[PDB]
Amino acid sequence: SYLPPLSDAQIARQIQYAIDQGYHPCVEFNETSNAEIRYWTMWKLPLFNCTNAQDVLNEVQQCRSEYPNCFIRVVAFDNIKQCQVMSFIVYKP
Amino acid sequence: SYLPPLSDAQIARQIQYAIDQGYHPCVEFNETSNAEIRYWTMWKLPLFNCTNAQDVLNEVQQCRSEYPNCFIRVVAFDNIKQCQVMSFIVYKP
Amino acid sequence: SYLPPLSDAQIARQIQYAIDQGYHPCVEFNETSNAEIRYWTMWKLPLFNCTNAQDVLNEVQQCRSEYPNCFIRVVAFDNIKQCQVMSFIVYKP
């Protein structure tokens, strides 16, 4: 959030990095992007075993169309360590 | 103490049993035989590696001569479990 | 008390040592020599500025004559540090 807004190629490059590490991408959305909000609403289910970053971007677009008034972010988690290993906002309403 | 007083042969037989089990005999004395008395006074040192019960009886006699006004008992301990495994009064003043 | 009883020459030699250091001798007595007894009864007053050890022994003798059934000891104190610097029994009843 302290860097210039990311392009679609930069976003996909961040997502691909997660996939390459073996992390599992997931899409979530909320009306506010405030960090005091503990839980965002999960979009469908986490994309387990997605090898393509475009498939993740596809779910972002589908989420945006249904919820244009909501913030959307992409998260990835390590199931072995059971921790979230990345989180960045992909869409501001 | 609820049985008839022990003879010297019975006492030596009790002591030999301890030795045969690998326990270490020791002689202690006190002015009172009350069980509320936590510590009696140790006579010399515990007889480590005594194979003869008579050697234990010898130390009892030597203790009795120096302290005829004191109770005397023989104890044996297991050093592996670190616990006292027998105790019986051998002389009442 | 773990040494052989002191002779009058040994006692006077202990007292003289105190005087030579600048300590102030004092004589006290009690019916018991037990250390749980906090206070003994003071004989007269402390001998301030006594340069002669015999003068201290003189007060011991006078105390013994009046109280033959009491323990007597000689103490010396440092008034600058305000602490007792020696104490030994000189007479057992």
Added chain:
Amino acid sequence: GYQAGVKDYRLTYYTPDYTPKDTDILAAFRVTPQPGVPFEEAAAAVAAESSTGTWTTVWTDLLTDLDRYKGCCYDIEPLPGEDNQFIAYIAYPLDLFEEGSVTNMLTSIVGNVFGFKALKALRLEDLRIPVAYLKTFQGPPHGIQVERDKLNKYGRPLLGCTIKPKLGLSAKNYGRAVYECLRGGLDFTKDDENINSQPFQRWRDRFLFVADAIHKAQAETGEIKGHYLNVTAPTCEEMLKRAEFAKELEMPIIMHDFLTAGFTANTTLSKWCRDNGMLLHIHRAMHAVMDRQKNHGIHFRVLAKCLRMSGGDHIHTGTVVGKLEGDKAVTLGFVDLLRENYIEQDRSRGIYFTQDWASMPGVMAVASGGIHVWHMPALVDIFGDDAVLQFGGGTLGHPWGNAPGATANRVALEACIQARNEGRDLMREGGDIIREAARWSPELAAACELWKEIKFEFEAQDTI
């Protein structure tokens, strides 16, 4: 039976045929004997006087089972590249140690042996803490995973500033600097290790104004903010009084100087932190008194293991590249021992023993001291995500002040993260990434210009 008198320690305490149990505590001692003292005798003295034995034979040994209680040297490793040195490997039975007591463990192993006349020097290099003993300790109040979940911060190292000057600022001025650092983009600010309660600034006044600063900066930025309020104190009661006030103010994090306060106080605080949901930042003040020299003292990796057991959520680990010493090989080793669940023996990184932590939570590494924006690519590359990078002078010494100083560091970090996540080599493209980001950030540009020539390059004492 009982044989009175002095005999050689090695007769009882050197056992080269002993195979360590999985329940034994293992110690690796770098031993320098006095001339004419055989290695076996020196090693046996260390084993004896850190477990069951004394200088002469005691009869009371025979009341018990000395053979199952004694420590023993089971291996000796000569160090031919050194002057009259060897490693003594010593095994201690589980039963010797008080459950959950770092204090007791250290009292036995390092209590008396370092002053033995027959040695010139002695250094404890490593300890293997068995799983059965580890289960008796709480460990960190929270640990890396839980901390990230409590703070809702993921995917990057965290950032902090230490307020400067170390001492002399008023409580109101302190809080002002905190608000400015935090609003500028830092996650954390902190009390200096020696800020406790003093004539120029009393602790309760500080705690209050810092809480105001956090609330303002959190509301303005929309990010969760914290400040490590130092609860280090004269007494345990005073330490807990300060922790309780931070809790009353709903502060997310406190700090503690574990060695200067001590392990008994620290273990008390770690339990309190677990009981109260408080994050615990640990400052390692005084460590270099013990851990710097190769020939004598206690290696930091041992102090770090002890801290993980006693408990802390963050611990200072050095910077490698900053104003304070930290060999890279040595550092990467003890960073792993602090963060990971299973660490394989690796002498190239000073790991003498394989260490299984049995699901004891990991500790966040903290890189702090003499670092600035130019060091960012190296700091990210060395420490990875699970670290906190702290800039005191590197923030407050910025040409334009605190808020720009903070933004400079935050931009620098986030640029280093993006670049790394794009597959770029931070050790090769380091300067390029910083220069690229400087175009977009005048704060960064100004920070880069000021500290271009500033490097700390000296020979390290504590090396493999």
Added chain:
Amino acid sequence: GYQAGVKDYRLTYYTPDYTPKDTDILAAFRVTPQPGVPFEEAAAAVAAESSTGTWTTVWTDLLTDLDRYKGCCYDIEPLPGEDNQFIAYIAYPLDLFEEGSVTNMLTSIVGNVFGFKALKALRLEDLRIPVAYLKTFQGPPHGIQVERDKLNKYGRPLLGCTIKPKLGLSAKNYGRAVYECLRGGLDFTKDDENINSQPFQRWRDRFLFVADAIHKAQAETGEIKGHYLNVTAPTCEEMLKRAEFAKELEMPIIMHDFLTAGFTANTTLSKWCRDNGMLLHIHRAMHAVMDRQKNHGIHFRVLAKCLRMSGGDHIHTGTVVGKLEGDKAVTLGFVDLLRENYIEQDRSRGIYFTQDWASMPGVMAVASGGIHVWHMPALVDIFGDDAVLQFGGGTLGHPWGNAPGATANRVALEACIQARNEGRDLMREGGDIIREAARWSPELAAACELWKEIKFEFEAQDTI
């Protein structure tokens, strides 16, 4: 105004024309700089990074009065007999320090400076603690004078035995050995430093049986007896729980391992001891990790001053002649610093600063470790009356056992006292006095024969 960037520490922190105030804390640091670092710059870095300064200029300095808060090197003393060493004298204003906090004082002065890249080594040799700061500390719970008055023991050193083996004895066996030592003529027995609470012996069982042993031995001998029950613990709550039980059992004395437990816990305990009339014996376990080597660490005299301030009634001071290192010159100096009210500067005994204690009570010196009956004349001569002489193996390792072992030591001491009070030279007539007393004491005779050949003679590391 504000000038951002790095400049030399010496520009602000080296002040050779400064005259120390009577309220300043003074530090004497033995400094070994890296090659190419000027003495003045190294000394100024130490002064800066232990007080107010950091590696670069901060604007916040200008909010305050840096000149009245900064530490400063006011004198540099080259050491031409050494390799690249000098003494840096540093003055710290009173306002920098938290009242009654040894923890805070050490955090500032020794917190970070020992790991500075620009130094090869650093040792804190001495501290001058001003009277105004001392008045903020309780000091010893009781001190020498009050302790002697509470125990009703005068005119001689006190005597103790450490129970052995260190670990492995049952609580009942422990109490048995205590009764035997005490009835034999010793004033005190003690837990080993590493006896806390363990699988082979839980603390409450020990405390109970030891209390029984004291009561029996006190009733039989008519002398007041004690046993230092070790309250060293994992947490402050557990430490105080153990101290409280000793109080409930009406025990006169407890012990504490001040460095392994730490200064925060120790200061808590010292206050509790004052509040409860409990005598406090202090074990210095771990000290040699920090204090042995000349080039690096913290001299024991500093740790000893810190202990006197935090509080303890006894502290271990070494033996000189026993199994653990203790140079005679160095020892006599810090023994004076622990016991006396006014100690004049004396570099021949390592006393860098004149120390006024402002009526803070003195601490009993404790000589312990590898000593036996032959050492008695030397121990009496070195330490004088206000000391406790402790014999572990020297009692329990006696040919006939504990009670004779105790009597051997008690006879040996009382003979050495009588002889000294007769004007005899203990250093000349040492062996003669022991031999004279041996005629009357078969216990002593047996002890003398067993340990005739036993001497500990090695070159000391910690020397002037």
Added chain:
Amino acid sequence: IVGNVFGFKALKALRLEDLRIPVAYLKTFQGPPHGIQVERDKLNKYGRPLLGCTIKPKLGLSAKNYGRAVYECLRGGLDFTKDDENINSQPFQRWRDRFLFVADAIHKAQAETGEIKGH
């Protein structure tokens, strides 16, 4: 381990026979407050099994009658006496009354025999 599995429809019966408790888990438990060795040391009783009597009838005795039975049992050579398992606090005998009278009985039996007594 035994929470839900015993009522599983797919089973007719289930019995847990044994558990191997690992050393690492055991170290998280206090275990006995004292155990065999320490108890003997506390009671000063070695070399033989200990002896006790349960006061009967199980229920229905007054506190004072309970104490009388305790004194008599203990003075006669038993180390211990005991409350029946279902003697807690009841209309026929309230616990605090029992505790007091039993303490009186122990003190008297212990003084007369010179052996340590308990209930």
